[PDB]
């Protein structure tokens, strides 16, 4: 119809070897790979401290600011050159701290009604990131344990690396989104085969463009 087409890995060996491409052109400097590096050392604290001050970083310690800015300005030079489907998995939580301990029933499966309350929540409706976003070429394994998945419709020419390849700490196919972004959920649905919870949204972009 008229909607656009995004593309989606299937085979590992390949998306690897595109990922790779990609960051073969990055052209990083070595201060931005530390950045990258030193990111995936302590993501969890440091999308903490994006969200807990809802973006503003002039309060982080001076070291802190100085690789958040690097980041930032990373993406400059990594940009998608494909329609890409990217994905994630995230806890309840992610949902808000309602669902914390309301989203799942004790077998696995998630309660319908909470699912409900999620959608009304979420459905049709922009959601702003303040931490960066770590998503996947592919649902690797580091997933399937969540109850929630994200899979992001990235268009062409969007900011995002492809870090697996800087860090050994990076995660399987890890696709990096830049902070402080807005996507939109265009439809909730539980998986067929014994509840969970896909989403899908169109990353709409970031506010941070240095330069």
Same mark, same amino acid.
Request: charged letters at 25%.
């Given at each position: 119809?008229? *909607? %656009?087409?995004?593309?989606?890995? &299937?085979?590992?060996?390949? !998306? $690897? =070897?595109?990922?790779?491409?990609?960051?073969?052109?990055?052209?990083?400097?070595?201060?931005?790979?530390?950045?990258?590096?030193?990111?995936?050392?302590?993501?969890?604290?440091?999308?903490?401290?994006?969200?807990?001050?809802?973006?503003?970083?002039?309060?982080?310690?001076?070291?802190?600011?100085?690789?958040?800015?690097?980041?930032?300005?990373?993406?400059?030079?990594?940009?998608?050159?494909?329609?890409?489907?990217?994905?994630?998995?995230?806890?309840?939580?992610?949902?808000?701290?309602?669902?914390?301990?309301?989203?799942?029933? *004790? %077998?696995?499966?998630?309660?319908? &009604?909470?699912?409900?309350? !999620? $959608? =009304?929540?979420?459905?049709?409706?922009?959601?702003?990131?303040?931490?960066?976003?770590?998503?996947?070429?592919?649902?690797?394994?580091?997933?399937?344990?969540?109850?929630?998945?994200?899979?992001?419709?990235?268009?062409?020419?969007?900011?995002?690396?492809?870090?697996?390849?800087?860090?050994?700490?990076?995660?399987?196919?890890?696709?990096?989104?830049?902070?402080?972004?807005?996507?939109?959920?265009?439809?909730?649905?539980?998986?067929?085969?014994?509840?969970?919870?896909?989403?899908?949204?169109?990353?709409?972009?970031?506010?941070?463009?240095?330069?």
């Amino acid at each position: 119809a008229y *909607s %656009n087409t995004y593309q989606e890995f &299937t085979n590992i060996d390949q !998306a $690897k =070897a595109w990922g790779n491409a990609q960051y073969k052109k990055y052209g990083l400097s070595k201060s931005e790979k530390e950045a990258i590096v030193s990111y995936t050392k302590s993501a969890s604290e440091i999308n903490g401290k994006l969200r807990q001050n809802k973006g503003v970083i002039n309060g982080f310690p001076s070291n802190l600011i100085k690789q958040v800015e690097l980041l930032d300005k990373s993406f400059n030079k990594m940009k998608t050159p494909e329609n890409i489907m990217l994905f994630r998995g995230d806890d309840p939580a992610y949902l808000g701290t309602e669902f914390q301990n309301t989203l799942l029933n *004790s %077998n696995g499966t998630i309660n319908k &009604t909470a699912f409900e309350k !999620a $959608k =009304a929540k979420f459905l049709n409706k922009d959601r702003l990131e303040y931490g960066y976003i770590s998503t996947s070429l592919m649902n690797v394994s580091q997933f399937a344990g969540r109850p929630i998945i994200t899979k992001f419709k990235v268009a062409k020419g969007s900011k995002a690396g492809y870090i697996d390849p800087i860090s050994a700490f990076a995660g399987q196919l890890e696709m990096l989104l830049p902070r402080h972004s807005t996507y939109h959920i265009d439809d909730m649905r539980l998986s067929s085969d014994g509840k969970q919870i896909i989403i899908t949204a169109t990353m709409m972009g970031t506010a941070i463009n240095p330069k």
